[PDB]
């Protein structure tokens, strides 16, 4: 009796996966003959090349936690194996007699890597490998050669492309396992019958003091059941305007399902169908780039450019990147990484987003572009570092995508509009609710200066309670300076990428 394997790394989910789907029905349609190891390998190596804090520590865990409910549910169960693949699939090959390994693709480059080697080896020891591209809606390598060989660089271009493309066949959950005892102890499952047990929240999360409020639960359970939850709304969604939503409710005023789609909680194909639903039904509604289709597109978008390009995360070396002389500040680096910049606007985002894990697209803007362009000319990998560990939807192509057409570095070059970190938060929070919030040391200045605590007298400080410099910190920078100095600097090394 030989085993079938499916491998989760991202596609954490049962519905619409076509590698976990032809395992089960394999296994279905030949009883007798199978065992089924639906497997997550807690990989030591990726922890070598990415950060990952707390809040998404236990988004994982929690997912896991789910993942393995779900599989119970269909009389099969999640085996999380500790260790490197590269010697963790030898080993498994051997001792479970593999015969098939599916698993859906990934264009990271340490995913392609990774996934170059594990298809050597399964070659190697006559293992059959079937990999799916689910984890977007479009096969970005198929894109890439409609367009003739090259990743289109303009949304407009990009959309022109995939309008021409088969949208794929989204899949239900598989059948439930008929007649599938449980497999049998191996070498390590003999010695500790929790071995491949899901990690508890002790296990994954070592810091657990930087765990914030549980608000967005990992899982796919939890993926469509907010996915059902913004979809009611059909008004809502079918004249959803991303530029229309705002930076700085308390409540999010967009959908939050980026954790869900980065670790494949939630099908993006699925979404995306649900969504083409409410367009169909609803006469009057948006259409790209803003609306929430257009939103898909944007992760499409990214993911496609992102797979030409293994140094996507990079200034050098990367394709798309304008090479600019970023200077290094690691105090003003230190200041905006703890949203202690002295701008309560800045430092609001920045406070939520290593709370909660989660900041609305252009709360994103407006910390991205202080950051690089805008005040502090600090170069964009160190804020997609930060955002990386931050990020409960950390995505290698998303973070480096957006953070490039922040800085105008690719994508976006109007670098002469710049947000004010003090005028840009007006706009949809008049009052300072979401600074009250997230900087409560301010809480008591009222609406006329809470965005510019530094034009209150030092009398009224004190009266707030709140004296700058002692309770919160004085500008790091003075904005008006900077950000003219930066366009400048900007000008100067558009100059020189344009003469090279
Ligand atoms: C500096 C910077 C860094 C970013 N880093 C990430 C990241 O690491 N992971 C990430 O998923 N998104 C990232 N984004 C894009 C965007 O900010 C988030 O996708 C969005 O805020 C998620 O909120 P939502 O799910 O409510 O979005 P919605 O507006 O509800 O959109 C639904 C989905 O569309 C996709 N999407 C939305 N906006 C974008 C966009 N601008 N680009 C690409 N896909 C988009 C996501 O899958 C999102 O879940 C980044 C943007 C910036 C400016």
Redesign the pocket.
């Given at each position: 009796r030989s085993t079938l394997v499916h491998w989760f790394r991202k596609g954490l989910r049962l519905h619409d996966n076509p590698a976990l789907s032809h395992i089960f029905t394999a296994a279905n349609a030949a009883p007798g003959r199978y065992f089924v190891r639906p497997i997550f390998i807690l990989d030591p190596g990726i922890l070598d090349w990415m950060q990952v804090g707390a809040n998404r520590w236990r988004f994982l865990q929690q997912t896991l936690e789910d993942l393995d409910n779900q599989l119970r549910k269909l009389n099969s169960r999640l085996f999380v194996v500790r260790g490197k693949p590269a010697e963790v699939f030898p080993r498994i090959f051997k001792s479970w007699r593999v015969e098939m390994l599916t698993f859906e693709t990934d264009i990271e480059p340490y995913s392609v890597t990774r996934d170059a080697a594990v298809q050597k080896l399964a070659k190697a020891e006559g293992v059959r490998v079937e990999t799916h591209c689910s984890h977007t809606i479009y096969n970005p390598e198929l894109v890439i050669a409609k367009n003739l060989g090259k990743a289109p660089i303009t949304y407009q271009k990009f959309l022109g492309i995939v309008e021409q493309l088969k949208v794929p066949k989204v899949l239900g959950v598989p059948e439930k396992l008929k007649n599938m005892p449980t497999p049998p102890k191996d070498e390590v499952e003999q010695k500790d019958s929790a071995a491949y047990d899901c990690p508890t929240m002790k296990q994954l999360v070592k810091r657990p003091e930087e765990l914030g409020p549980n608000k967005f639960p990992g899982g796919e359970t939890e993926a469509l059941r907010r996915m059902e939850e913004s979809l009611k709304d059909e008004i809502w969604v079918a004249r959803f305007e991303?530029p229309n939503?705002a930076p700085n409710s308390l409540e999010?005023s967009?959908?939050?399902?980026?954790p869900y789609?980065?670790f494949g909680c939630l099908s993006?194909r699925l979404f995306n169908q649900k969504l083409k639903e409410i367009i169909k039904r609803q006469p009057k509604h948006s259409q790209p780039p803003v609306s929430?289709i257009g939103?898909?597109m944007?992760?499409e978008?990214?993911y496609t450019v992102a797979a030409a390009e293994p140094n996507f995360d990079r200034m050098l070396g990367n394709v798309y990147c304008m090479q600019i002389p970023w200077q290094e500040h690691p105090d003003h680096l230190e200041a905006w990484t703890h949203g202690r910049t002295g701008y309560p606007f800045i430092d609001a985002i920045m406070r939520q987003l290593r709370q909660e894990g989660?900041?609305?697209?252009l709360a994103?803007?407006a910390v991205?572009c202080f950051l690089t362009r805008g005040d502090l000319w600090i170069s964009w990998e160190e804020?997609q570092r930060v955002?990386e560990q931050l990020?409960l939807?950390?995505?290698w192509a998303?973070?480096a995508?957006?953070?490039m057409?922040?800085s105008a570095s690719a994508f976006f070059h109007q670098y002469f509009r710049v947000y004010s970190p003090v005028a840009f938060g007006k706009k949809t929070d008049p009052q300072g609710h979401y600074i009250r919030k997230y900087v409560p040391e301010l809480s008591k200045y009222p609406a006329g200066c809470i965005y510019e605590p530094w034009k209150a007298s030092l009398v009224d400080q004190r009266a707030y309670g709140c004296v700058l410099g002692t309770d919160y910190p004085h500008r790091i920078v003075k904005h008006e300076v900077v950000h003219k100095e930066n366009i400048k600097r900007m000008g100067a090394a558009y100059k020189v990428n344009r003469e090279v």
């Amino acid at each position: 009796r030989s085993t079938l394997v499916h491998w989760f790394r991202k596609g954490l989910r049962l519905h619409d996966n076509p590698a976990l789907s032809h395992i089960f029905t394999a296994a279905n349609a030949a009883p007798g003959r199978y065992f089924v190891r639906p497997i997550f390998i807690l990989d030591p190596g990726i922890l070598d090349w990415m950060q990952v804090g707390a809040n998404r520590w236990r988004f994982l865990q929690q997912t896991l936690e789910d993942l393995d409910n779900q599989l119970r549910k269909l009389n099969s169960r999640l085996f999380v194996v500790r260790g490197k693949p590269a010697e963790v699939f030898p080993r498994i090959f051997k001792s479970w007699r593999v015969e098939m390994l599916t698993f859906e693709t990934d264009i990271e480059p340490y995913s392609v890597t990774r996934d170059a080697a594990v298809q050597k080896l399964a070659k190697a020891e006559g293992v059959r490998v079937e990999t799916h591209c689910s984890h977007t809606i479009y096969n970005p390598e198929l894109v890439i050669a409609k367009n003739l060989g090259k990743a289109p660089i303009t949304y407009q271009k990009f959309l022109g492309i995939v309008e021409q493309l088969k949208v794929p066949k989204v899949l239900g959950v598989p059948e439930k396992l008929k007649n599938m005892p449980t497999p049998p102890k191996d070498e390590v499952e003999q010695k500790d019958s929790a071995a491949y047990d899901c990690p508890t929240m002790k296990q994954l999360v070592k810091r657990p003091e930087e765990l914030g409020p549980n608000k967005f639960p990992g899982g796919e359970t939890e993926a469509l059941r907010r996915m059902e939850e913004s979809l009611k709304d059909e008004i809502w969604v079918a004249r959803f305007e991303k530029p229309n939503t705002a930076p700085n409710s308390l409540e999010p005023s967009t959908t939050v399902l980026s954790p869900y789609l980065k670790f494949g909680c939630l099908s993006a194909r699925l979404f995306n169908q649900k969504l083409k639903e409410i367009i169909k039904r609803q006469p009057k509604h948006s259409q790209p780039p803003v609306s929430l289709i257009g939103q898909l597109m944007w992760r499409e978008f990214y993911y496609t450019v992102a797979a030409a390009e293994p140094n996507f995360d990079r200034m050098l070396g990367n394709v798309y990147c304008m090479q600019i002389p970023w200077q290094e500040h690691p105090d003003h680096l230190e200041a905006w990484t703890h949203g202690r910049t002295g701008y309560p606007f800045i430092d609001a985002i920045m406070r939520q987003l290593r709370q909660e894990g989660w900041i609305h697209h252009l709360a994103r803007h407006a910390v991205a572009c202080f950051l690089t362009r805008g005040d502090l000319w600090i170069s964009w990998e160190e804020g997609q570092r930060v955002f990386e560990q931050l990020l409960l939807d950390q995505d290698w192509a998303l973070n480096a995508g957006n953070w490039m057409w922040l800085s105008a570095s690719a994508f976006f070059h109007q670098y002469f509009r710049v947000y004010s970190p003090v005028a840009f938060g007006k706009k949809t929070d008049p009052q300072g609710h979401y600074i009250r919030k997230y900087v409560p040391e301010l809480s008591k200045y009222p609406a006329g200066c809470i965005y510019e605590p530094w034009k209150a007298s030092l009398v009224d400080q004190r009266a707030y309670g709140c004296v700058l410099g002692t309770d919160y910190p004085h500008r790091i920078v003075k904005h008006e300076v900077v950000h003219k100095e930066n366009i400048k600097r900007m000008g100067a090394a558009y100059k020189v990428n344009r003469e090279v």
